[PDB]
Amino acid sequence: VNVPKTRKTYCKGKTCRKHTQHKVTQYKAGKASLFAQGKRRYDRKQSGFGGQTKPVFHKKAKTTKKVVLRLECVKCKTRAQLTLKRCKHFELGGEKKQKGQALQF
Amino acid sequence: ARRPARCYRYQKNKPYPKSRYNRAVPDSKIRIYDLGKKKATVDEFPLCVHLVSNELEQLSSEALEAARICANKYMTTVSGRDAFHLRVRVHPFHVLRINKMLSCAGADRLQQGMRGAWGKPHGLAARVDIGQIIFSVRTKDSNKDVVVEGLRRARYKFPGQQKIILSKKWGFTNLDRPEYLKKREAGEVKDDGAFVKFLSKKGSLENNIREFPEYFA
Amino acid sequence: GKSHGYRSRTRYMFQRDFRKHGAVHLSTYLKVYKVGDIVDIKANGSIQKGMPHKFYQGKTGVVYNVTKSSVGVIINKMVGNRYLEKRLNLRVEHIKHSKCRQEFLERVKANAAKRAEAKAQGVAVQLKRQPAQPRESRIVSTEGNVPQTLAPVPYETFI
Amino acid sequence: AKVHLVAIDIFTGKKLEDLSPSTHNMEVPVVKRNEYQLLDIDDGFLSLMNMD
Amino acid sequence: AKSKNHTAHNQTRKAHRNGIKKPKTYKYPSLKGVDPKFRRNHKHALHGTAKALAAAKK
RNA sequence: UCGAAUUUGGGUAUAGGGGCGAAAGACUAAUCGAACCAUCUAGUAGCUGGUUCCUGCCGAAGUUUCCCUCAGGAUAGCAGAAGCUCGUAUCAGUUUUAUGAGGUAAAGCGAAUGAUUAGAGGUUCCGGGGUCACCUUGACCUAUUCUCAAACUUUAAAUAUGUAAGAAGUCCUUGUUACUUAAUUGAACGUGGACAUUUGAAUGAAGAGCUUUUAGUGGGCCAUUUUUGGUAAGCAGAACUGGCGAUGCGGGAUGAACCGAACGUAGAGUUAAGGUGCCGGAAUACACGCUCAUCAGACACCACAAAAGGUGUUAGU
RNA sequence: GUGAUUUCUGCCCAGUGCUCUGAAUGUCAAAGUGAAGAAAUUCAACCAAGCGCGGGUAAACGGCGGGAGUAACUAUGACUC
RNA sequence: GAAGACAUUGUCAGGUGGGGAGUUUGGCUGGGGCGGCACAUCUGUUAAACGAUAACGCAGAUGUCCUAAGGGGGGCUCAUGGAGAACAGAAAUCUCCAGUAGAACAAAAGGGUAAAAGCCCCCUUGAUUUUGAUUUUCAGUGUGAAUACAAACCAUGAAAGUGUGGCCUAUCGAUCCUUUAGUCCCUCGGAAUUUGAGGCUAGAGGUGCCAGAAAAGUUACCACAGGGAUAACUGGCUUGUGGCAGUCAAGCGUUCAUAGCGACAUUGCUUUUUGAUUCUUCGAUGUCGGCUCUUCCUAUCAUACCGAAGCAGAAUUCGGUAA
RNA sequence: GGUUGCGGCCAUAUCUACCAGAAAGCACCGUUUCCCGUCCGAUCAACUGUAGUUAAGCUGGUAAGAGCCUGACCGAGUAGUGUAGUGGGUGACCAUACGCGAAACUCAGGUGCUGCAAUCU
RNA sequence: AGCGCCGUGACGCAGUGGAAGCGCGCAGGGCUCAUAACCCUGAUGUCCUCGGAUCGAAACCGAGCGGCGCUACCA
RNA sequence: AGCGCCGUGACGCAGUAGGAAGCGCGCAGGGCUCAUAACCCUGAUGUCCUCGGAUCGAAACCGAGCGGCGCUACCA
RNA sequence: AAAAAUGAUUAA
Ligand SMILES: C[C@@H]1C[C@@H]([C@H](O)CC2CC(=O)NC(=O)C2)C(=O)[C@@H](C)C1
Ligand SMILES: [K+]
Ligand SMILES: [K+]
Ligand SMILES: [K+]
Ligand SMILES: [Mg+2]
Ligand SMILES: [Mg+2]
Ligand SMILES: [Mg+2]
Ligand SMILES: [Mg+2]
Ligand SMILES: [Mg+2]
Ligand SMILES: [Mg+2]
Ligand SMILES: [Mg+2]
Ligand SMILES: [Mg+2]
Ligand SMILES: [Mg+2]
Ligand SMILES: [Mg+2]
Ligand SMILES: [Mg+2]
Ligand SMILES: [Mg+2]
Ligand SMILES: [Mg+2]
Ligand SMILES: [Mg+2]
Ligand SMILES: [Mg+2]
Ligand SMILES: [Mg+2]
Ligand SMILES: [Mg+2]
Ligand SMILES: [Mg+2]
Ligand SMILES: [Mg+2]
Ligand SMILES: [Mg+2]
Ligand SMILES: [Mg+2]
Ligand SMILES: [Mg+2]
Ligand SMILES: [Mg+2]
Ligand SMILES: [Mg+2]
Ligand SMILES: [Mg+2]
Ligand SMILES: [Mg+2]
Ligand SMILES: [Mg+2]
Ligand SMILES: [Mg+2]
Ligand SMILES: [Mg+2]
Ligand SMILES: [Mg+2]
Ligand SMILES: [Mg+2]
Ligand SMILES: [Mg+2]
Ligand SMILES: [Zn+2]
């Protein structure tokens, strides 16, 4: 799929509260960042004797992911998250379609 | 090596024609449906004799072929080929299925039983009911006994009950003989390939003169 | 596996009628529905918005809500051992007035008219409908109508 | 059932073997091949050009 | 060992044992699903007509 | 086999996931693919078996959805109990009237889409093997003709199915509003007034509504009809209804389900289904015919019969 | 491991295993080192063995192919692909 | 005498470690296993004209694709045929006529659509924010999908109007944990500041056994609880397959359908084969054959008496009564 | 009654061939400076209503016309079907009783009706 | 019975939805007295059939044909 | 015993989904050679195993026979 | 010290 890098959409930033211009990027997760409480609990539980203490997932079925769009207002820098359907190929702001063109083979 | 006809005698299933969902059907055994002087005109063979079914069943194409051969061969041997026209009036459109099993000692190691029992096409049958014409013969009045006994011989090739009916219609037309005579004495009948065309009060007038010209005189 | 989607088994009842395809005539859109009107549900297959589910084809209900292009229809649906109130949001394409309720309203006006006349003259106007009564006596004259008919007929081949 | 599998690495050319029950799942890569036109080859490192 | 898959046998007899009952309509049904603009109006119309009735009766 | 890798006493050593094994998973005190004794320990069991007095009243389920769910649970239903608010109704496994909805049965194919038999007449700048604008395998068109469809259809039943048949109604004024209209227009809700005892079809109503809480069940099976797979099946799988299970009684000799009819303890009468030669209660009744079998026949479910044939005999065309 | 004597014990080290090097590099723990921070801490470099890369080894585990043409009767195929 | 701050020993860290330990090794299923997916779904049919409806029924499809293939508006009309135009021909572009869709609309199938939902062009982001109500599956739970409003902000158009993704019917995912966005808010409990951590609202990372454990085999050395809910022997139903009989009569039999045969067809019977089924038996009915011994059946090989023959005789062949 | 503007039902309105059309209306029609749009003033834009024509559109008629619409004790109470019997038949199936009931077929008619507003030999 | 695979130039075989390639074989010329070797040059394919989807299939789908195989266990 | 197959010159092989047969060896005759062999050309050689059927027409389709090939043939 | 195989039968 192909989504533009720029998009006009509603911004609920308490100063816009209206359709403003947004910059579009893809959401990236970020580092798991140990010292999170779940990570501390997990390290404490895995210490000592007893083997593996938690489930280890194996039965992978999905091959794609949902794409999340990170929308940034250009007036107040407020951000918003939009979700798209599953896709295999995702690209941002590239190569708008040409309608009446010969096949390149 | 084909199953006896009692396995497929009755119309237990819905019709199962060759279609885009079936498309893997063997060819029917019967290919010829008109025999004798099939190009003969209507007025040449005023007499019609029918082999009317008396049971609601289905007739295999093998039986249709066998009775076709028997009736045609007898009538051709006795009164020649040009003395009659035989039209068989049922087509094997229903497909029979067989769930084929192994038939040897040791079949139990691989037999699979009644699982996935949907059968594959096995043969073709024509579905007929009470009073449905199977065979029709048109000939002259003087050739009545030959075609009657030929249809009697064809009867033994079919399962169940069948009657022999002398028609009161002129040949293969839907008209009685006296009314067909009344129509040729007028200008209401024009010859065609083997059948005829009729003149009506309806339609374009000038068309009804270019056809049937000798009427309106 | 089995398939039980929203529009399954609707092949023939979401057809348009033969030689009746195309656009909808404006009398569909000029009909006025009030709350309390009794309407019949029949989906127009050419309008895929506000379309009722296949269950409600042929059901008759009461309008409870009126919106811009749609009405809210209340239908009683038998689920198990009781009827559940079901509320539908249907565009007016799939909706027509119940003609039976139109004759009921006309009959109410006619009943009022009969009672109004009877209050002045001709008391005991006897409003209620009655079922088809047995016929009374009559004298069937034969003069010019002499009875004449034969017996059953013999069997003939006709083949 | 179990499946014994013998396969050659598509890059290193080495034989790999593995075995698994016939009804468990294994991964299959998303192997794709692409046409390119051969420009210069200087320090190895073939320089290639796409359909564009 | 396969068992029976499905049947609606005896289900109507069970349903009719305690009868199939209509949902007992009331006067003044709930305004759930009615248009909010209509509901907002109707609150003020009811308030005004009760005010007029109480003012007249005293 | 019998002079040695011999046989054997006594002593001694090796102890249980340990020993010992010229190897058999052998042996380790009648115990060995992990001894024996005691304890944890009344170990756990969705599995088998059992589960102790009487009478009275009511009275099932084998189905829905979810579950490493398929011999089990939860959930809803079916059942009981406690009742509560009222006192003939906001009702109904029914009909009528009115009004919808449907695409099956049937039908149709010289109507669409597919399938399909045979000729006829025209179209070769549409290729016909043929000689200078032709009968002579084709393909196309036109008018015909034979036969078809679970996944074709113009048409289109029967049965089943929705709704309405008023007081929470109808009509007349004029009130509310921030909704609506160009508007003092509507929308919805109202004040006041009018409508009489047929308050707006029929029949019935055994009291009508309402609530809490909890049992068992969650293997089903049979019959008529519809119906799928299968050569078929006392086969496997669905639909509606009635049954059996849970149920005796009369009849079908016998039999879960068929027919009749459902059950407190008795008496009398009358019947059902089925019968009335004798077993066996009840006409070896009456009447008109048919049948003679050196393998007659003799009551539905049901305990089978076919294609085919006969100057047997009877009736008939 | 094989199993008296006799006579033999062919070919295959790609896989699995076993074994032997290098420092030319990849992976790379704890401790130690450096840097940013107020500090917890974060980042980076260095980084043993093993792994990885590369040799050896079958009386280690084991393994030990298809198709086609071709001779002056055919048939077969010494030969050839 | 050797050896020496090295070894050793202690603690932590990486590797190796079936030698040993613990555990697991899905379900449905005409028994199980192998196969398949009928395990979450969608179209048509089965399905019996409301709705619902099963099978390892039938014919298929889904785990995607799309900044346009979404939204609005404008203009035009498609498949196909006929007649024509240099190269150009059956298929290149151009023109006219006919053309109810016989085209196209991402992708199965069904439905829908002609001044359009198709094709081309001009703008655009409504594929947005806040929640509630509703429909389908349904317990009237969730999830997925969808319908109609409300309050905003917008797009498009002259405007009515339309637009909360794809013309409709499929295209997907809880708890815990991690992560991001939002409010710049609440808490770290002796009082503050700053890091850090924890909360509230809303997305993502995934459970396809799709209401969502983290999971390899073998056992003929085997064990237990059970099951005739379920296979393997007998019996029962069926009789495809096996075996036997009939009807017809093309043809064979020098001449001649039927002395004897008898194709193509077709009607049966039997239970001595093999299957199908799963009703009886799993707190056990001893499971092949042979040997021994009795009896029964007849569909008769021989023997008795017969009829027929392409029966001179002989020898045969067909048939009746007959076990 | 004709015509026009907007329509309602959406073929009794459609289709094929031919004929006719006072008056008005509609239409064809003439032109490109302007607004606007094209490969092309052909469509669309604008101007004139003048220069011309009913040739075409449009409206009506004609046709043993095609289609479509309505009806018939035409087929036919046929096909189908609900209920019932210890009905018939070996069975497939069939009849009867109490009910409902087609579609093809044949024949006969018909071929737009109409609302608001303006105008007219 | 159920399931899987293969079919390409004369032969053995590759093959990326944009009309097919390696090795021999074959053909032409040369060298040799001649053949082979050798040298210089060319050519050879409804991709098993018949339909379908796609603008376009050798590849995808449906059938039909011909070969190769696998399962065949507890009784 | 069943279920599939196949049979084409003197010898082998090709048909194909019906409109009468091709190729290669062998034979004979020619061309080359002193004469041969090899080579080349040409010709002959198949009543498609027999019989029967359906068809306008069968080596191709159907049945029988004959011969050969391949697969299958209690049971615990 | 590069490579270099073959040549049908009979006929003083
Ligand atoms: C596969 C990974 C983890 C998974 C999930 O946290 C796994 C389990 C872990 C656990 O122990 N208890 C749970 O309740 C969930 C999840 O959410 C996915 C999106 C991402
Ligand atoms: K089941
Ligand atoms: K249907
Ligand atoms: K184990
Ligand atoms: Mg610790
Ligand atoms: Mg540790
Ligand atoms: Mg069936
Ligand atoms: Mg939509
Ligand atoms: Mg001795
Ligand atoms: Mg052992
Ligand atoms: Mg012992
Ligand atoms: Mg009691
Ligand atoms: Mg009781
Ligand atoms: Mg039990
Ligand atoms: Mg149970
Ligand atoms: Mg019970
Ligand atoms: Mg009895
Ligand atoms: Mg009864
Ligand atoms: Mg007595
Ligand atoms: Mg040794
Ligand atoms: Mg060796
Ligand atoms: Mg470190
Ligand atoms: Mg081995
Ligand atoms: Mg272990
Ligand atoms: Mg299982
Ligand atoms: Mg599930
Ligand atoms: Mg239905
Ligand atoms: Mg968190
Ligand atoms: Mg049982
Ligand atoms: Mg048999
Ligand atoms: Mg059992
Ligand atoms: Mg027992
Ligand atoms: Mg047991
Ligand atoms: Mg015994
Ligand atoms: Mg006998
Ligand atoms: Mg020599
Ligand atoms: Zn902003």
Would you mind describing this structure in some detail?
This is part of a larger assembly, with chains A (105 residues), B (217 residues), C (159 residues), D (52 residues) and E (58 residues). Chain A is built from one helix and six strands. Chain A is mainly β. Chain B is an alpha+beta fold and 217 residues long. Chain B contains four helices and ten strands. Chain B has helices at 61-79, 144-155, 177-185, 205-210; strands at 34-36, 47-53, 57-60, 84-88, 94-98, 120-128, 133-139, 162-166, 189-191, 196-198. In chain B, a hairpin with a 4-residue loop joins strand 9 and strand 10 (196-198). Chain B is elongated, with a radius of gyration of 22 Å. Chain D has no helices and four strands. Chain D is an all-beta fold and 52 residues long. Chain E is mostly helical and 58 residues long. The longest helix of chain E has 22 residues, at 36-57. Chain E is elongated. The chains are: A mainly beta (105), B alpha+beta (217), C alpha+beta (159), D mainly beta (52), E mainly alpha (58). Chains in contact: B-C, C-E. The interface between C and E is medium-sized, with 14 and 14 residues. The complex binds ligand 3HE, potassium ion (3 copies), magnesium ion (MG) (32 copies) and zinc ion. The site of one magnesium ion has 2 residues of chain B, from loops. Residues 12-13 of chain B line the site of one magnesium ion. The structure holds seven RNA strands. Chain C: It comes from Saccharomyces cerevisiae (strain ATCC 204508 / S288c). Chain C: InterPro entries: Ribosomal_eL21, Ribosomal_eL21_CS, Ribosomal_eL21_sf, Translation_prot_SH3-like_sf. Chain C: Belongs to the eukaryotic ribosomal protein eL21 family.
